[PDB]
Each structure stands twice: as C-alpha cells, then as structure tokens.
Design an enzyme around this catalytic site. Sequence first.
Site, PDB file in Angstrom:
ATOM      1  N   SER A  28       0.829  -1.199   0.000  1.00  0.00           N
ATOM      2  CA  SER A  28       0.000   0.000   0.000  1.00  0.00           C
ATOM      3  C   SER A  28       0.877   1.268   0.000  1.00  0.00           C
ATOM      4  O   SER A  28       2.077   1.222   0.347  1.00  0.00           O
ATOM      5  CB  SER A  28      -0.925  -0.016   1.251  1.00  0.00           C
ATOM      6  OG  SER A  28      -2.007   0.902   1.125  1.00  0.00           O
ATOM      7  N   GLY A  29       0.300   2.386  -0.446  1.00  0.00           N
ATOM      8  CA  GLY A  29       1.052   3.627  -0.425  1.00  0.00           C
ATOM      9  C   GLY A  29       1.381   4.152  -1.795  1.00  0.00           C
ATOM     10  O   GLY A  29       1.120   3.495  -2.799  1.00  0.00           O
ATOM     11  N   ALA A  83       8.393   1.334   1.612  1.00  0.00           N
ATOM     12  CA  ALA A  83       8.773   1.428   3.031  1.00  0.00           C
ATOM     13  C   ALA A  83       9.145   2.883   3.328  1.00  0.00           C
ATOM     14  O   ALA A  83       9.420   3.672   2.407  1.00  0.00           O
ATOM     15  CB  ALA A  83       9.970   0.516   3.343  1.00  0.00           C
ATOM     16  N   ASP A  84       9.141   3.254   4.603  1.00  0.00           N
ATOM     17  CA  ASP A  84       9.499   4.613   4.950  1.00  0.00           C
ATOM     18  C   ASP A  84      11.004   4.728   5.120  1.00  0.00           C
ATOM     19  O   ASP A  84      11.564   5.783   4.860  1.00  0.00           O
ATOM     20  CB  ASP A  84       8.729   5.060   6.191  1.00  0.00           C
ATOM     21  CG  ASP A  84       7.231   5.070   5.919  1.00  0.00           C
ATOM     22  OD1 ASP A  84       6.833   5.848   5.033  1.00  0.00           O
ATOM     23  OD2 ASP A  84       6.476   4.279   6.532  1.00  0.00           O
ATOM     24  N   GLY A  96       3.903   4.643   7.529  1.00  0.00           N
ATOM     25  CA  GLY A  96       3.600   6.041   7.242  1.00  0.00           C
ATOM     26  C   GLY A  96       2.204   6.109   6.618  1.00  0.00           C
ATOM     27  O   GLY A  96       1.423   7.027   6.922  1.00  0.00           O
ATOM     28  N   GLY A  97       1.900   5.129   5.749  1.00  0.00           N
ATOM     29  CA  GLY A  97       0.609   5.072   5.070  1.00  0.00           C
ATOM     30  C   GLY A  97      -0.493   4.400   5.887  1.00  0.00           C
ATOM     31  O   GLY A  97      -1.587   4.126   5.370  1.00  0.00           O
ATOM     32  N   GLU A 103      -0.157  -5.195   5.956  1.00  0.00           N
ATOM     33  CA  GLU A 103       1.082  -5.371   5.204  1.00  0.00           C
ATOM     34  C   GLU A 103       1.888  -6.507   5.856  1.00  0.00           C
ATOM     35  O   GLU A 103       2.441  -7.360   5.164  1.00  0.00           O
ATOM     36  CB  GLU A 103       1.917  -4.052   5.146  1.00  0.00           C
ATOM     37  CG  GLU A 103       1.247  -3.008   4.211  1.00  0.00           C
ATOM     38  CD  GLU A 103       1.847  -1.580   4.260  1.00  0.00           C
ATOM     39  OE1 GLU A 103       2.514  -1.207   5.256  1.00  0.00           O
ATOM     40  OE2 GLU A 103       1.613  -0.809   3.287  1.00  0.00           O
TER      41      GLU A 103
END
Lengths: 219, 219
Positions: A28-29, A83-84, A96-97, A103
């Site tokens: 996701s993101g 990934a952040d 973050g998302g 996930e």
Amino acid sequence: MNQLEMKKLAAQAALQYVKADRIVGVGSGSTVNCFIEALGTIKDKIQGAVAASKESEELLRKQGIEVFNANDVSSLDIYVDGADEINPQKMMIKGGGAALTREKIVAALAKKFICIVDSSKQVDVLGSTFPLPVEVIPMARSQVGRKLAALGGSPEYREGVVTDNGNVILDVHNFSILNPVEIEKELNNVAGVVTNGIFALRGADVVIVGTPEGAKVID
Amino acid sequence: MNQLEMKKLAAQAALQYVKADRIVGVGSGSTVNCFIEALGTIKDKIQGAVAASKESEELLRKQGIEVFNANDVSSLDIYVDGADEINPQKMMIKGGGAALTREKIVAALAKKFICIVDSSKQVDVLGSTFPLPVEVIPMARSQVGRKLAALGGSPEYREGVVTDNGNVILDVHNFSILNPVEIEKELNNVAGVVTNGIFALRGADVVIVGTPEGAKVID
C-alpha cells in the site's frame, strides 16, 4: 530526477518478478500505487492480487485486476511494497501510510518480499529520519503511549486517523532503533499494540531502488 | 455445591480487595458477572470501574456503577477476572468468553491481578482440559490456522463469533502447553494474531477459589 520518477522506475523494475498466471501480493502507499499502474499494464499475464489495504484493493479493481482475499491462498510467490526507511540489512520501518497491520499479514504469506523504494528511503540507522508507527487498540492508547515513553520515545497520536482495522496510530519520535529485531519483538508483547512498524523479523528479500541512473536491484 | 455457587463464593470473597474511593478493574465472563452483582452491593463505596468487555460495561451500568475508559486512568489498584484454566504458578488460559484482548489490556493497567475461579479451573497442565483461544484479524484466519497446526495444535474457527474488537477466534485443540511463557511470546510474533489466551508473562497475583468448603485465597 524527482522522487515520483524514481518510485515509477522501481515499480517498473518490480514487474520482472511477476510470475505468469499467479496471484501477486501487493502492499500500500504512493510507491505501490505506481506499481498498481504498472501491473494494469500487464494484467492479462496474472491471475489476480491479494492487497494490504482497501485503497489498494479499489485501485487494483479499477485496473481490471481481480482481488482475492488472503484467506483464499495458501501462499504467494511475491509481495511488493514500499517502506518509509530501509537499512543495508534490508530491515524496514513501515506504517507512514497507516496500513502496516495488513502489510505484515500479506508479507507473511509471501515467499519473496520485494521492497520498492526511491533513493531517499535508504538509511543506515532505522528510526533516525522517521518516527516509528505503532498501531494500537483504541482503548489501549494511553497505556501504550506510557510504555513507549518509558522506552525512551516521544509517542504522538495521529489525529483523527483510523486504520482499515479500526485502530489508532501512535508515531514514536526521538526513538532511534539500534536493535530492530529486539524492539520489534518487545513491542509485540505489549498489550494493546496490534502491530509495530519494524519489519525486521521478516525483512525484504529483494530491494529495488529508483535512482537517477535507473532502478537498482539489490537481490 | 455446584460450580455456580462456587463462582458466587469466590466473587463474594473478592470484595475484601475492593477499597473505598477507587476505580476497580473488572473482567468478563460468568464468574465476573457474579462479581459485578457483588459490586452492586457496595456500589456507593467505589468510584467506578474499568471493564474488559462491552457486556461487562452494560452489566455494570445496570448496577448503577460508573464505567470509565481505560484511557482515563494511569493505573488501577486491582483487576478481578476469571479464567478457563489456572496452574499452580498462577499462569492462566483465558478467552472462553471471547474477551481476551481487552482483558489483557486492562490487566496490564492493574497493580494486582485477582483471579476468581471455581475449583474445577485448577489444572496442573495448561491446555490439558481446554482448547487455547487465539484472537485473529479476520483476513489472517487461514494463515494463522496453518501456523497453529504447524506448532502442533488442531485449530478450530469459533463459528459465528465476532469479538468486541471485530475479530474472529481460533480455539486450538489437542495442544498441551508445556512452556506457557515461551508459547505466549511465540504466538505474539505471528502476523494476524491480536491476542493469545495464555496469561503467563503477566499471570494472577491473587487466586480466589470457590470450593464446597468455602472460598479459599491463595495470596
């Protein structure tokens, strides 16, 4: 080259790992959204996808790709997600998302975790440039915040945000994470914590980084 | 006497731990329901309660007791709750009543965990007379079921049950728990598991057992 172009480069290179007629694990993101568009580009080649957020699900269906429930598969060949932060050991900070719980669940079903990232996400010390996201049962918010502060962090509730699972997120500031696997497990035993953003017990298998010189695969 | 009368004896005996002007932590389940009735009896001596289930919350309000949110307190003096099994080391198996997630959350707030049971709940080996309840994010049901089978159990989805947190429950049959502390930690690392019913990292501090000979306190 800007950040979005780099995300697009990594996402395009991730297609090389997609197996014909199989179900793809999708994260996701923003970077993954680039991947969802790339996937639509070769959709007849796949059977469908299992996705880590209702947003990713809706986008995949908009691309004409069938979405399957995780419960319908016994495993996935790959799981592609952003990934952040990601360190040289392929350990990541995610959330973050706000989709870290599903996930981690989808990643657990996949044989190969392919993390796609723009160059700025590569860090040597996890937690140095991004606060750790922690998903928390709502009624447990204060006590988990107290535990996080006892651990040396400065927890901050993400105002008005609710995850696909109905929980809140606390982002932990001033919390460099020198020992990711150790902290991941420790937080896993805290009552009220649903999931924490350290993906270290099971990190990425392949890292695809979008750079000005093109996508670079660390496999 | 039968188990219902033993439950009432243990609940009545728990009252001696309730002190004036304090917020009482209360669990969920048939034995706690006898305790909630007892609490009504001294209603005006207490400040209120923090409860581990919507059902306990409702029963408490009907007794005229103010219910507070766990987030409203930084600590609770006591937490009174039942258990499905309890060993000589005061480690318990809980979750028969599907309230294990919130019970583990409220128990983490309390200084003193007071477990009230009838004598049939005492066992030498956890998992010997009761299948282990495991609360799972619905989309992870199948994969967690496969993990539990791999650990050697026989997981069975609890049909039609949905917890206060919107999750499902897998009850693990033929699963003797020879090392509760280790197993509790192992299950806490499985993606998809919200809470497992082993209360061993944080067991009971006081055990009150209803017996045909009266309630017996193990302080």
